[PDB]
From Swiss-Prot:
Annotated domain remarks: The presence of a 'disulfide through disulfide knot' structurally defines this protein as a knottin.
Single Gene Ontology BP annotation: negative regulation of serine-type endopeptidase activity
Disulfide bonds: C8-C25, C15-C27, C21-C33
Gene3D superfamilies tied to this protein: 4.10.75.20
Identification of the protein by name: Trypsin inhibitor 2
SMART domains: PTI
One Pfam family recorded for the sequence: Squash
SUPFAM superfamilies associated with the record: Plant inhibitors of proteinases and amylases
Lineage: Eukaryota, Viridiplantae, Streptophyta, Embryophyta, Tracheophyta
Site features described as Reactive bond, chain residue numbers: K10, I11
Location of cross-link (2-aminosuccinimidyl)acetic acid (Asp-Gly): D4-G5
Subcellular localization, as worded in the UniProt entry: Secreted
Length: 34
C-alpha cells in the first residue's frame, strides 16, 4: 500500500515497477507490492 492511491489489499506479488501491482499498491523498496 502507497496510501495516496487508497488502501491496497497488500498481496505478496513480487514486482519490478508500480504497473505490476493492483490499484492502490506501489512496488515497494523490497521488490514486492504494498
Amino acid at each position: 500500500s502507497g496510501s495516496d492511491g487508497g488502501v491496497c489489499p497488500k498481496i505478496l506479488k513480487k514486482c519490478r515497477r508500480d504497473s505490476d501491482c493492483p490499484g492502490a499498491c506501489i512496488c515497494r523498496g523490497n521488490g514486492y507490492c504494498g
